[PDB]
């Protein structure tokens, strides 16, 4: 999964899935070296508008996190970026993958890949407040066959993860979280 | 309702422990409860302690009882790209707003920057800095505007 591409879980109406997510720069960086102009997103992936807003709010939270984090870098403020969300999630579970995008853009910023074969899901709110998500079972069995090493899950959901049949959980490392900054503290030691 | 069920499960597993279990008398206790209902569902009491800049608890009368939505907003862009260039920093409200909320939020922003100069002329942070805004969905269509005070 080189930079700007990541696998992603989805709770399909039939079983789980690990659809990927992709992001890319969309225009030359230096059309105007001084130009003060938005690095506008252009999302795609047969999104319903309920998603199309959510990608945007996530976008704003990413750009906020980044500007809070790395003042010298100005990448994200100014360059067009196209983004793809492959079909497959059951719609009620669609927003749940928002964080992966939030992480994708960051990888596209640093140009440094995530820790490998690190599936992750869970809804997020605008200050990185991870929220509990359902369907841990199907997501787990899908990941088990996907080479996953280190799932990260809502800190409010661990019990449900611990309600699953024993042999399933063997192997993979897990992490529980509330603030997204933790995830950013995992992927980049 | 949901507590009704969540009791029925307790009594039911308690029956199973009688007809074949060892103790003749269940004496449920808060600590004993795991055996009968398992691990907790709700652990965070409120969603979280307020983030100082951009949240205020907002009560709302959704279809099934009231709820304390948070509302989250953020500066949408660097503030000092142009200390002199003069363009408004508009909101982008979201959250599957109803049209009345559209009008409501527009009024709120304009009154907001009207207030900021009304009382703190030297400050200009809101009149000339970008803003994303997000009212959560959930509110009854009629009460949507009632969040506007927050």
From Swiss-Prot, chain A:
The active site is at residues 96, 139. The lineage of its organism: Eukaryota, Metazoa, Chordata, Craniata, Vertebrata. Homohexamer. Organized in a ring with a central cavity. The ATP-binding and proteolytic domains (AP-domain) form a hexameric chamber, while the N-terminal domain is arranged as a trimer of dimers. DNA and RNA binding is stimulated by substrate and inhibited by ATP binding. Interacts with TWNK and mitochondrial DNA polymerase subunit POLG. Belongs to the peptidase S16 family. Duodenum, heart, lung and liver, but not thymus. Residues 1-189 form the Lon proteolytic domain. It comes from Homo sapiens. The Lon N-terminal domains are crucial for the overall structure of the protein, maintaining it in a conformation allowing its proper functioning. It is linked to CODAS syndrome: A rare syndrome characterized by the combination of cerebral, ocular, dental, auricular, and skeletal features. These include developmental delay, craniofacial anomalies, cataracts, ptosis, median nasal groove, delayed tooth eruption, hearing loss, short stature, delayed epiphyseal ossification, metaphyseal hip dysplasia, and vertebral coronal clefts. This is Lon protease homolog, mitochondrial. ATP-dependent serine protease that mediates the selective degradation of misfolded, unassembled or oxidatively damaged polypeptides as well as certain short-lived regulatory proteins in the mitochondrial matrix. Endogenous substrates include mitochondrial steroidogenic acute regulatory (StAR) protein, DELE1, helicase Twinkle (TWNK) and the large ribosomal subunit protein MRPL32/bL32m. MRPL32/bL32m is protected from degradation by LONP1 when it is bound to a nucleic acid (RNA), but TWNK is not. May also have a chaperone function in the assembly of inner membrane protein complexes. It is found in: Mitochondrion matrix.
């Amino acid at each position: 999964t080189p930079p700007g591409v990541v696998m992603g879980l989805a709770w399909t109406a039939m079983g789980g899935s690990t659809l990927f997510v992709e992001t890319s720069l969309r225009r030359p960086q230096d059309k105007d070296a001084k130009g003060d102009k938005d690095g506008s997103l252009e999302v795609t992936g047969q999104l319903g508008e309920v998603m199309k807003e959510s990608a945007r709010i996530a976008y704003t939270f990413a750009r906020a996190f980044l500007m809070q984090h790395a003042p010298a870098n100005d990448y994200l403020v100014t360059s067009h970026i196209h983004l793809h969300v492959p079909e497959g999630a059951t719609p009620k579970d669609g927003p749940s993958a928002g964080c992966t995008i939030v992480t994708a853009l960051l990888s596209l910023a640093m140009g440094r890949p995530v820790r490998q074969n690190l599936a992750m899901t869970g809804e997020v709110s605008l200050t990185g407040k991870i929220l509990p998500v359902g369907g841990i079972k199907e997501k787990t069995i899908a990941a088990k066959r996907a080479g996953v090493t280190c799932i990260v899950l809502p800190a409010e959901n661990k019990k449900d993860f611990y309600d699953l049949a024993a042999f399933i959980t063997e192997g993979l490392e897990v992490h529980f979280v509330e603030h997204y900054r933790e995830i950013f503290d995992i992927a980049f030691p | 309702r949901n507590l009704q069920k969540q009791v029925e499960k307790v009594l039911r597993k308690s029956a199973y422990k009688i007809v074949s279990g060892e103790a003749e008398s269940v004496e449920v206790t808060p600590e004993n409860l795991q055996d009968f209902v398992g691990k907790p569902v709700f652990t965070v009491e409120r969603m979280y302690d307020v983030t100082p800049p951009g949240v205020v608890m907002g009560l709302a009368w959704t279809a099934m009882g009231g709820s304390t939505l948070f509302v989250e907003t953020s500066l949408r862009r660097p503030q000092d790209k142009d200390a002199k260039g003069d363009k408004d920093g508009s909101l982008e409200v979201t959250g599957q707003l109803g049209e009345v909320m559209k009008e409501s939020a527009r009024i709120a922003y304009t009154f907001a920057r009207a207030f900021l100069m009304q009382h703190a002329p030297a400050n200009d942070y809101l009149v000339t800095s970008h803003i994303h805004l997000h009212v959560p969905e959930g509110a009854t269509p009629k009460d949507g505007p009632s969040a506007g005070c927050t």
